[PDB]
């Protein structure tokens, strides 16, 4: 009865193809020449860095590097609030609690580590050691102060409970390494990447994937939710950013350019959802328009590749940081 | 410029000083990563040293050089994604033994990459007594084309070593080799010699004058 699957697939193909009919709102003015400049130089790290996150105060950002140290900077005055020494040196992700009391990170150790900030003794320490996965971790997010959502290399995504310390549920079905899981603003749905050019939305309560989007040719590496909580964009090693809408169930705007031949490492939207930031595996940070489909924004520096970039909740500034151990704040 | 952020800033400077001290202390050692393929490989080497489902790091001590050895053995996930972080590592270790010789092309695959190129490879042939006792008997075969060589023994071993090599398409690579019988303690010494040699080569390449 496997042929029924490939006939149903043609059915849904015709369905999506018919539900759509580029040539709309093209008359709007272009964003124009957009240029950002460096305002701060966060130069505390020693080795390559991978990920960073913004707190809800839009003041403190935490980044992780191969040296195994987490730094809570003061973006205003370039100070160092805390320096956490890690147990496992190899890390690929970090996360900041919405309440600002906890910080979490994980990597090749296959265990998510959660830290505490506010304490009587005035020193940071571990809280829980989540150990359910058998593969390398990719990213962690906080649904709230009590629940964490993570995505490992076992083609599986699991939701935990810090106080319980056990996997309350597990999501699976991607049949490939899942990377860069980003929560939605509604904090009730999310979409995760995969190694087979596939993206799936998931339900935080029911426990099964709702939709499965396709259409890309190679591995994808980044994904993030739109501010409206009704769309998302995905980056991939094919130097292409593709925008998908759950309502449309089809790709909307394929950003491309002949000159660029590289990959993609991280993406993030803007406060109003008009600037589509991205970080390439090159010596720049390419910036694209929301739906006008033009390679407008370009950012020079720094020397090495680019790994991560994250926009603040309020949009006052943007942050960057990569393998050269330097972090720049562009305003 | 205000009372208390003056204290905050001096705290920040103390943190920076402590961080720099820790970094200069930590970067002093040397790092070798071994990713033996297949089976019957790296187990003997890791056993020759004198909470699961994760990479295991082994720390060594030899002539005031303690070594940090990482083996991604339990990683069931794809190599391309987590393989890259090891970029700034002095030497790699390669173990093979003794058909099912896809390790031959795997060696070529790891030796040729868009990054990671300028690194020497220390490959081991840890099963030598087994091969010898297999070659006194005539399997023979050899299931290779145009071998056209003497059956036993050093001739066949040298032909094998010529194979599985010569795929270095770049200069300034110093591929090493050894004949391990899974019963000798010389592995640490030859590893140390290879490390010392690559450090000297590196230093010479640095102005350089190379």
């Amino acid at each position: 009865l496997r042929q029924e699957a490939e006939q149903l697939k043609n059915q849904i193909r015709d369905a999506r193809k018919a539900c759509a009919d580029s040539q709309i709102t093209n008359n709007i003015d272009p964003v124009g020449r957009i240029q950002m400049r460096t305002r701060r130089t966060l130069r505390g790290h020693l080795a390559k860095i991978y990920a960073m996150h913004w707190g809800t105060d839009s003041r403190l950002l935490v980044s992780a590097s191969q040296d195994g140290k987490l730094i809570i900077w003061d973006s205003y005055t370039t100070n160092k609030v805390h320096a956490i020494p890690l147990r496992s040196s190899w890390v690929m992700t970090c996360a900041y609690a919405p309440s600002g009391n906890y910080v979490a990170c994980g990597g090749l150790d296959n265990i998510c580590s959660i830290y505490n900030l506010k304490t009587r003794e005035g020193n940071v320490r571990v809280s829980r050691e989540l150990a359910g996965h058998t593969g390398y971790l990719s990213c962690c997010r906080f649904l709230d102060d009590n629940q964490i959502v993570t995505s490992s290399g076992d083609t599986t995504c699991a939701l935990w409970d810090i106080e319980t310390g056990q996997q309350t549920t597990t999501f699976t079905g991607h049949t490939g390494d899942v990377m860069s899981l980003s929560l939605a603003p509604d904090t009730r749905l999310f979409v995760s990447g995969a190694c087979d050019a596939s993206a799936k939305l998931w339900d935080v309560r029911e426990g099964m994937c709702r939709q499965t989007f396709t259409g890309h040719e190679s591995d994808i590496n980044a994904i993030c939710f739109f501010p409206n909580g009704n769309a998302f964009a995905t980056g991939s090693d094919d130097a292409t950013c593709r925008l998908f809408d759950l309502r449309a169930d089809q790709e909307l705007m394929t950003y491309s350019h002949d000159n660029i031949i590289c990959g993609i490492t991280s993406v993030s939207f803007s406060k109003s959802g008009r600037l589509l930031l991205a970080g390439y595996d090159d010596f720049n940070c390419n910036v694209w328009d929301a739906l006008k489909a033009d390679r407008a924004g370009v950012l020079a520096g720094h020397d090495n590749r680019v790994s991560c970039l994250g926009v603040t909740d309020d949009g006052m500034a943007v942050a960057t940081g990569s393998w050269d151990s330097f972090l720049k704040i562009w305003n | 410029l205000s009372a208390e952020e003056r204290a905050a800033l001096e705290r920040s400077k103390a943190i920076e000083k402590n961080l720099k001290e820790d970094g200069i202390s930590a970067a002093k050692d040397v790092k070798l990563l071994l990713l033996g393929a297949g089976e019957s490989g790296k187990s003997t080497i890791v056993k020759q040293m004198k909470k699961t489902t994760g990479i295991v790091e082994t720390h060594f001590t030899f002539k005031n050089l303690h070594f940090r050895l990482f083996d991604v053995g339990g990683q069931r996930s794809e190599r391309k994604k987590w393989i890259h972080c090891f970029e700034d590592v002095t030497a790699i270790i390669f173990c093979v033994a003794l058909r099912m010789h896809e390790s031959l092309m795997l060696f070529d695959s790891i030796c040729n990459n868009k990054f990671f190129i300028d690194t020497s490879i220390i490959l081991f042939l840890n099963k030598k007594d087994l091969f010898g006792e297999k070659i006194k008997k005539s399997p023979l075969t050899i299931c290779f084309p145009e071998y056209t060589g003497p059956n036993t023994y050093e001739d066949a071993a040298a032909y094998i070593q010529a194979q599985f090599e010569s795929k270095n398409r770049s200069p300034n690579k110093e591929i090493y080799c050894h004949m391990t019988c899974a019963t000798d303690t010389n592995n640490i010494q030859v590893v140390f010699d290879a490390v010392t040699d690559i450090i000297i080569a590196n230093n010479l390449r640095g102005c350089g004058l190379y």
Partner: single-chain antibody
Amino acid sequence: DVQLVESGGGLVQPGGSRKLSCSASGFAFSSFGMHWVRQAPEKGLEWVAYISSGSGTIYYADTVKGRFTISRDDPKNTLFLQMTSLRSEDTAMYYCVRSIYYYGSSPFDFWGQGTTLTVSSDIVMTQATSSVPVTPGESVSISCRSSKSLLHSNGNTYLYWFLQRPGQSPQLLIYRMSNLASGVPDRFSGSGSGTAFTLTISRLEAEDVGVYYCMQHLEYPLTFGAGTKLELK
């Protein structure tokens, strides 16, 4: 939890010598800046001296220079303060207070027990009156008159409040005159303007009666207000 035990005081003849030791436990003492505060046996508060967490910065009060010295040793978790050439005015009981300074910090959070000691410009704030009759279940208002505006360019208001239980060590109520300290009921709420400072207490109860104090941190040296005491008539 955190405990501060100090015992180094005693009746010393004027012109003699003595040393003070405040023992710290239950927290990372090595990463905290430490404070000395004395209280007169009848009334009044004042700042004695302060030592940085890294011990790279030292301060003393106006009438302390040349007579008293301070020093701390991290491995011993104790602070050393030397009383030299003590005067007849020095007869007062002391307090050793911990502090910490970074973004979003709450200094002077925990106070010690104190020692008994006997013998034989800068902005100043005043509180008046020092005694108001109150009733349970009724909100009260407290104000501390200040000399110079404390609103720094950083958008902050460097001022702190305190409450001393009758016969017990004082503890903090509001830090930076706008926030809430840990373990404090939400009824309390600091307020005030750049120069005028007001304290608000809603639903006062019979266990919150005591003496209030106002203290500024914009510039060294520190200073303390006259204070206000309540009653349950």
